[PDB]
Amino acid sequence: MATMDKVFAGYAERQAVLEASKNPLAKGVAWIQGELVPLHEARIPLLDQGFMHSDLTYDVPSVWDGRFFRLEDHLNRLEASCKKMRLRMPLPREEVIKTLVDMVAKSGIRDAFVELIVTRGLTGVRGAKPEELLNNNLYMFIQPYVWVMDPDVQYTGGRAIVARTVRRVPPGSIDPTIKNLQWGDLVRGLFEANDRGATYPFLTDGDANLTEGSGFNVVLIKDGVLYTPDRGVLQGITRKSVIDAARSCGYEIRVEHVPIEATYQADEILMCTTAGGIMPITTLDDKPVKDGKVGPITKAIWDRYWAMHWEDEFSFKINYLE
Amino acid sequence: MATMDKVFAGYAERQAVLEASKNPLAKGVAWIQGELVPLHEARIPLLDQGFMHSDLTYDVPSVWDGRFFRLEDHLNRLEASCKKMRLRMPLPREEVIKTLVDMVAKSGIRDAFVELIVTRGLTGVRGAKPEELLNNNLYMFIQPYVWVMDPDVQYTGGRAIVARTVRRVPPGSIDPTIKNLQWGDLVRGLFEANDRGATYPFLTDGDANLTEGSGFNVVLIKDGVLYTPDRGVLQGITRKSVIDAARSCGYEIRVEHVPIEATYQADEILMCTTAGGIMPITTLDDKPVKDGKVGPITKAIWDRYWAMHWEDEFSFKINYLE
Amino acid sequence: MATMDKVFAGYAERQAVLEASKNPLAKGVAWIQGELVPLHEARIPLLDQGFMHSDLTYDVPSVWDGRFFRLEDHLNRLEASCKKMRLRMPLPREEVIKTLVDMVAKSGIRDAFVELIVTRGLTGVRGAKPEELLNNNLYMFIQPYVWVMDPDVQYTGGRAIVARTVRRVPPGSIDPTIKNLQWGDLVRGLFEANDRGATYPFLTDGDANLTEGSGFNVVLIKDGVLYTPDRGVLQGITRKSVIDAARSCGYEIRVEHVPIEATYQADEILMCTTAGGIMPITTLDDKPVKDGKVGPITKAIWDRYWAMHWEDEFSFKINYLE
Amino acid sequence: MATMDKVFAGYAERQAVLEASKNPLAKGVAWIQGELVPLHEARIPLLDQGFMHSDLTYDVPSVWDGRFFRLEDHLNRLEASCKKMRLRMPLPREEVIKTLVDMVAKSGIRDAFVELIVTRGLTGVRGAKPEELLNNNLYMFIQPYVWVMDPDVQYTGGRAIVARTVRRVPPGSIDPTIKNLQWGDLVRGLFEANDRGATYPFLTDGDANLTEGSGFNVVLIKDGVLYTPDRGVLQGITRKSVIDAARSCGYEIRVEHVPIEATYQADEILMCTTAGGIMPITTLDDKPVKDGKVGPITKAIWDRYWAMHWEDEFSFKINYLE
Ligand SMILES: Cc1ncc(COP(=O)(O)O)c(CNc2cccc(C(=O)O)c2)c1O
Ligand SMILES: Cc1ncc(COP(=O)(O)O)c(CNc2cccc(C(=O)O)c2)c1O
Ligand SMILES: Cc1ncc(COP(=O)(O)O)c(CNc2cccc(C(=O)O)c2)c1O
Ligand SMILES: Cc1ncc(COP(=O)(O)O)c(CNc2cccc(C(=O)O)c2)c1O
C-alpha cells in the first residue's frame, strides 16, 4: 500500500480495537520457562546472568497488520549473535515460531513488538569451565508496537544532535553487530540529547565517523545517493529493508564509512528501526536539514518499506483464530 | 591478625558451620520490594530496566568473620555512581544499613558477599521525560563469600594473560568508575583467557596501557614501588585498601598510567577485589613472573589488607542475635 | 611590568628598530653544521631523516626584551624528549647556550623565536642496528618573535572551534609530551577552523575530552578555578608558567581530564604558547564565551606571565655587545 | 619470468655493473628547483614546511630491470593524496615523467627506488589564508633499489612481532591512505621489534585488528584464502598487485577487517611493499608460522608479482641512451 495517511489510518483502527480489549493479554504476554504470563506480571530469576552481567543477546522482530515482518531474518541474526557469544538457542526454531505465533494470536495484538532474549543462564562465566555454561535461558515477550518516533511526528521529522559527551562502544570492546542490552553509551546519548533540547542522539566512533543512535541506524541522503555506516553499528533489519527499498525504487545506497561532517552536508537524514520504521530527521544540532522538511527520497523509502509488509517475500500472515 | 594460614583457617571453621546449617537462608537471602526471599527463589520484574537495558549501577561490600568491611566507603561509591547516572538510592542510608545487617544476621553467614543494585526502574529512558525516570528500583542480596582466586591458589599465584582480542570499554562510552554490570568486554576477556590456557584476563585501553580485569584491579610491583592504573578502571575499595596498606607497611604506591610493557617487566603482580582480596599472579602469557613465586611485597600487602578486617577504623561487628 | 599596553608598546619600539636594520641577520640566522647562515638562505641535507621521516624532536624557547625566558626548562624538556626517542643532544649544553646567545646577539633581535631541532641524522631507523643510529643531527635558528594571536587581537579575544573532523593523535601512537613536527592532525584542525570561519582548532582525544590545539595548550576558567588537560598534550612551558602565575596570583589550577562539555560551560577560555603568550578565546563554535569579552582571571594571568619575563628566577639578560 | 633464483640472479648481474660505475649519479640523483644534483649532495631549504611540519605527501614508484613498474598508479595515488591535503602537483604529469625518465637514464640505475615529495612550500598553514598556501614544492630523487627484506632472507622468511607498546595512528588523526612521512608510530614499532629480537613490527589499530607495518602492508593466508586489512592502512601498489596476482593465480583475496588473532592462526604470512616486493614472514612473536617455512601460496604470489614487471600492462621500458 504505502502512503503515510493510509498506513497510519489502518494502525489507528486496529489500535482502537486493541485499546477496548478485555483480554488480560492485550497489554502483552511473556513466555517464562514454558508458561505464558501477562507481560506486566512477568518475572525472571534474580540470579539469571542476563540480569547479573547483562550476559545475553536479543532480537526484536515485529508484527504489522497481523503479518510477521522478516521473521527469519531476525531469527538468523539472533542465531548468529548467539554463536558469536558462545550461546545457543534453547529451543529449536519450529518450537520458537510456534510459540511466538501462539502468543501473538492469544494476545490479539495486530501491531506488535516481539522480543526474544537468550542469556548465559544461571551460571556466570567468571570461574566456570566452558562446559558449565551451556544451560542458556530463553525469554520471549510480545507487547503493543512501540514508536521511537510517533506517527504524527513522521510527517515533519524530528530533532537530532551529534553527541559530543559520549561515543559509541568500539567493536573491539563489544561487537555492535551482536544485538545487546548493554546500553550505557546509548543512555548517555539520550540524556545528552534531552539536555540539548533534542530527542535523537547520533553517536560517533570517537574517530570522527558517524555510527548509530539509541535504538536506530542512521542513513544520509546526498545528491540522490544514500549513505549508511558500515562499521560500528548493528546491521539493522530495517536498514537491510532500506537497502532493498533503495534498489527497488532505483537509488544507489553505499554502506561505507560516513565521516561525521557528512551529517552537516546531507540533503535528507532518516533513522531506521523496527520500533517505528522510517523516521525522518529535519533538525540537526538546532539547525534545519536543508529546508527543514521531509525529503523526497526519504518519502520514497518510507512508502516502499511499508509496502513490503504486505508482500510474501518479506512477511507472513498470522491466524488469530478469532 | 594476618598470615595466610590463620586467615584461611578461621574461614574454614566458619564455613564448616555454615555448610551444616538447616537455615533456609544459609545459601543467601534477597530483598525484593520490602520482602526477604531465599536467594535461589528470588525473582525480579521482566520489565525492570536493570534487565531490559542493564540501566543500573551496583556495589558489593562484604562481611568477614561477622564484620562489615568498609561499608560506608561502598555506600558512598554507590551514591556517587547513582548521581553520575541520574539515579537516586530508593531508601535512606539508615534503612539500607538496618536492612543489610538484618539480612546478614538472619542468614547466619559470617563471610558474605553483600550486593546492592539500583536500577532505572520500570520506565525506560528512551522516549521519557527526565521527571518520568525518578522511580528507581533497589535490589539487595547476600550470599556466601565468593573467591575469584581460591585460598589454596593464593599461596602459589595464578595465571594471567594480557588480552589481545578485546580491550576495555573506554570511559567516553561508559565511565568505568561507575560500577556496572555491562560486562561484554570482560566476558570476552574471560573466554580469551580460557582459550589461551589462563584464568585472568588483563585488558588494555586500546592505547597500549594496562587497565583492569574481569572483577579486579591490577597492581604491579617494580623495584620496591607499587603501580596501578589511574584511568580506565573502577576505583576499587580493595585497591583503596592496598593504597592504605602500602602507606602503612611503608612502601610507595603510584596511581598513574601503566604502559602495558610494565606488566612484562614487573617483579611481582597482584590482583585485588572484594571477591577474594589480594590475589597474586605468578604466570603471565605462559611465562613466570620473575621466579614464578609469590613476592615479598605482595605478602606484606596481603597480611595488612586482612589485618584491617579486625580494625575499628575499617570494620564493624554485626550482632547475629544467635 | 605587565599591562597589555605597556608590554606591547615596548615590543613596538623594539620592532621599529629591527624593521629598519641593515644587518643581513635581522630576519633570522641558522646554525647548520657549525656555520651561521641567514635564515632564508639556510639549507639542510635532503637525506636527513628529520625530513625523510620527520624523525626528530624540537623545542622553541624565546627571547623577550633581550632576555631569554625559561631557557633551562626548554633545554631540559628537549633533553627528556631526546631520551624518549633514543636521540642525544649532539653538543654539550654549554656549547648550545653559547651558540644560541651568539646567534641572538649577532642578529640584533630582541624579541625572538629560538628553535632547536635534533634529528636521527642521515641513517634511517628502518633496517639499522641501534648502534648505527647514534650520529644525530642538530639544527638551530632564530627568527623574529611569531604571534599565534596578534597583539591587537589579544585585547578582544579570538575565535575557536571544537574540531569535529579530526582528533588528536593518541599517546599510544605518538607521545604528545615529546614535542614534534608530525602535525598531520593539527594541520587538519587548522583547515577545519578556517572552513568553519574560525582561527583556532581545539582537538578532542576521540573519547570526548579536550586536549590541545595547533601550537598551543588550552586552559578553561570556571567559577574562579582554572582547568587544563593532563593527558594527550604537550606539557607546555607557557602552561607551566600559567600554573606558576595562578599560584602566585592566588588561584587554584587543576591539571586533570577536561570533558569537552566543559568548554561550552567555561567562564573564560585562554590558549597558551611560547609563540604569542596568553591568548584569550571569546567566541567558541560561533557563540560568545559568556559575555564575549576577555575575562578578569585571564587578565590576571596575562599580566603575571609577562611580569615573569623580567624576573631573575625565570629569565636572563643577553649582552648584545652593540 | 619469476622464480626467486632467476629474478635475483638478474638483479645481481645488474648490481655488479652499477657497483663498478664511475658515474657520479650512480648512487642516485635529486631534482631540486629544476636542477639535478648527486643524491648525497642534495639540499633543501630549512624553511620548507615539508621539514618544518612534515606538511607533505609522497610516493615511491620503482624501476626494475630498466622498466618502470605501475608508474601511473603511483602518480594517480600521489595526485589523490595531494587533493586530500589541499596540495597540487607543481609540474604537469608529462614534465614529471620526462624528468623522472631523464634522471633514471642519467644515473644508469636499472633497479631503482623513485621518490616524489610534494610539500606545502615555504608558507606554513598556521596563520595563513588558503590562497597563501598554493605555492607548493616538489622534490624528486632516485636511488638504488632498497630491500626491506634482503633477497637471501626471502627464501626462508623473516621475524615479526605484533607490537604491544604502540598502535597505528588512527585515520581520524591522519588518513593512512595519504602516503606520508609522519612515522612516529612506525619508528616506535621498529624499536620495539628490535628490543624483542625481531625485525618487522605489525601494528594494531588499538581495537584488536591488524593494520600495517613500518613500510609494508600485511597479508595473511588461511585455508587457501588471502586476507588483508581494509582500513587503517596505505592502499599499497604492491598490495594492489597482490590482489591482481591472487585473481590471476586463481585464489580468493578478501580486503576486510582482520582481527589480530588471525595472525596467530595463519597458514602463511607475507609483507608487501615497493621496497622489496613480496616478503615472507615465518616467525611471529618468537614462534614459527605453521612449519616455519615459506608457504606455497606465498610462492605463487611471489612469482606472479615479479612476472608482472615484464608485462606491458604493468610496466614500460626506459631508454638509457647508453
Ligand atoms: C543500537 C541499535 N541499532 C540499530 C537498531 C535498528 O535495528 P533493526 O532495524 O534490526 O530493528 C536498533 C533497534 N533495536 C530495537 C528494535 C526494536 C525494538 C527495540 C526495543 O527493545 O525497544 C530495540 C538498536 O537498538
Ligand atoms: C571491573 C572491576 N574492577 C575492579 C573491581 C574490584 O573492586 P572492589 O575492590 O571495589 O571490589 C571489581 C570487583 N567487582 C566485584 C566485587 C565483588 C563481587 C562482585 C560480583 O558481583 O561477583 C564484583 C570489578 O568488577
Ligand atoms: C602541540 C603544541 N602544544 C602546546 C604548545 C605550547 O607549548 P610551549 O608553551 O612550551 O611553547 C605548542 C607550542 N609549540 C611552539 C611554540 C613556539 C613556536 C613554535 C613554532 O615552531 O612555530 C611552536 C604546540 O606546538
Ligand atoms: C606505511 C606503509 N604501508 C604500506 C607500504 C607499501 O606501499 P606500496 O606497496 O605502495 O609501496 C609502505 C611503503 N612505502 C615505501 C615504499 C617504497 C619506498 C619507501 C621508502 O621511502 O623507503 C617507502 C608504507 O610506508
Q: What is the DSSP track for C252-303?
A: -EEES--BTHHHHH-SEEEEEETTTEEEEEEEETTEESTTSS--HHHHHHHH
Ligand 1, from A183, A273, A308: best to mutate by most atoms within 8 Å of Cβ? A273
Instruction: List Cα–Cα distances, C208 to A166, B233, B274, in angstroms.
Output: 6, 17, 31
CA distance B295 to B224: 11
CA of D38 to the centre of ligand 3 (A): 36
Q: Which method was used?
A: X-ray
Nearest CA to ligand 2 atom 1: B215
Binding residues of D for pyridoxal 5'-phosphate: 77, 237-238, 274
Binding residues of C for pyridoxal 5'-phosphate: 77, 237-238, 274
Longest dimension (CA), chain A: 59
Instruction: List subunits contacting chain A, requiring 3 or more Cβ pairs under 8 Å.
Output: B, C, D
Q: At what angle do helices B237-248 and B296-307 cross, to 10 degrees?
A: 110
CA of C170 to nearest chain B CA: how many angstroms apart?
A: 7
3-state secondary structure chain A: CCCHHHHHHHHHHHHHHHHCCCCCCCCCEEEECCEEEEHHHCEEECCCHHHHCCCEEEECCEEECCEEECHHHHHHHHHHHHHHHCCCCCCCHHHHHHHHHHHHHHHCCCCEEEEEEEECCCCCCCCCCHHHCCCCEEEEEEEECCCCCCHHHHCCCEEEEECCCCCCCCCCCCCCCCCCCCCHHHHHHHHHHHHCCCCEEEEECCCCEEEEECCEEEEEEECCEEEECCCCCCCCHHHHHHHHHHHHCCCCEEECCCECHHHHHCCEEEEEECCCEEEEEEEECCEECCCCCCCHHHHHHHHHHHHHHHCCCCEEECCCCC
Best of A162, A164, A173 to substitute, by most chain C Cβ atoms within 10 angstroms, is: A164
Best of D164, D195, D204, D263 to substitute, by most chain B Cβ atoms within 10 angstroms, is: D164
CA distance B301 to B278: 8
In this structure, which amino acid lies at residue C82? C
CA of D201 to the centre of ligand 3 (A): 31
Query: Which has the closest alpha carbon to D62: D27, D100, D23, D17?
Result: D100
Q: Which residues of B203-235 are buried (b: 16+ CB within 10 A; e: fewer)?
A: bbbbbbbbbbbbbbbbbbbbeeebbbbebbbbe
Residue B237 counted as an annotated binding residue: yes
CATH no. of D1-145: 3.30.470.10
Q: Where in chain B is the domain with CATH 3.20.10.10?
A: 146-322
Q: How many residues does chain B have?
A: 322
Binding residues of A: 77, 237-238, 274
Count CB atoms within 10 A of the CB of residue C246: 22
Taking an 8 Å cut-off on Cβ atoms, the answer to whether A257 and D231 are in contact is: yes
Q: Are the CB atoms for D180 and D236 separated by under 8 Å?
A: no
Q: In which residue are the cell numbers 597482490 written?
A: D242
CA distance A158 to A153: 7
Distance of CA C182 to the CA centre of its chain: 15
Instruction: Determine if ligand 2 sits within 6 Å of the CB of residue B149.
Output: no
Q: In which residue are the cell numbers 518475572 written?
A: A43
Query: Which has the closest alpha carbon to C53: C122, C107, C100?
Result: C122
Q: Are the CB atoms for B151 and B145 separated by under 8 Å?
A: no
Residue B199 counted as an annotated binding residue: no
Q: Where in chain C is the domain with CATH 3.30.470.10?
A: 1-145
Q: Which atom of ligand 3 is nearest to the CA of C217?
A: 4
DSSP state of B132: G
CA distance B185 to B165: 10
Q: How many CA atoms lie within 13 A of A231 on its CB side?
A: 16
Taking an 8 Å cut-off on Cβ atoms, the answer to whether B174 and A170 are in contact is: no
Which residues of B lie inside 8 Å of D (Cβ-Cβ)? 162, 164-167, 206-208, 259-261
DSSP C107-140: HT-SSEEEEEEEE--SS-STT--GGGS---EEEE
CA of A262 to nearest chain D CA: how many angstroms apart?
A: 14
CA distance C217 to A73: 51
CATH no. of A146-322: 3.20.10.10
The answer for A137, left when phi > 0, alpha when psi is -120 to 50, beta otherwise, is beta
Which residues of C lie inside 8 Å of A (Cβ-Cβ)? 162, 164-167, 206-208, 259-261
Q: Are the CB atoms for D89 and D118 separated by under 8 Å?
A: yes
In this structure, which amino acid lies at residue B73? D
CA of C189 to nearest chain A CA: how many angstroms apart?
A: 12
Residues of C in contact with B231 (CB under 8 A): 231, 257
Q: Which residues touch C90 (CB under 8 Å, ≥6 apart)?
A: C118, C136, C137, C138
Residue in C172, C207, C257 closest to B170 by CB: C207
Best of C167, C174, C204, C207 to substitute, by most chain B Cβ atoms within 10 angstroms, is: C207
CA distance D277 to D151: 10
In this structure, which amino acid lies at residue B320? Y
Q: At what angle do helices D71-85 and D237-248 cross, to 10 degrees?
A: 130
Instruction: Determine if ligand 1 sits within 6 Å of the CB of residue A217.
Output: yes
Instruction: Determine if ligand 2 sits within 6 Å of the CB of residue B180.
Output: no
Instruction: Determine if ligand 4 sits within 6 Å of the CB of residue D59.
Output: no
Resolution of this deposited model, Å: 1.5
Taking an 8 Å cut-off on Cβ atoms, the answer to whether B39 and A46 are in contact is: yes
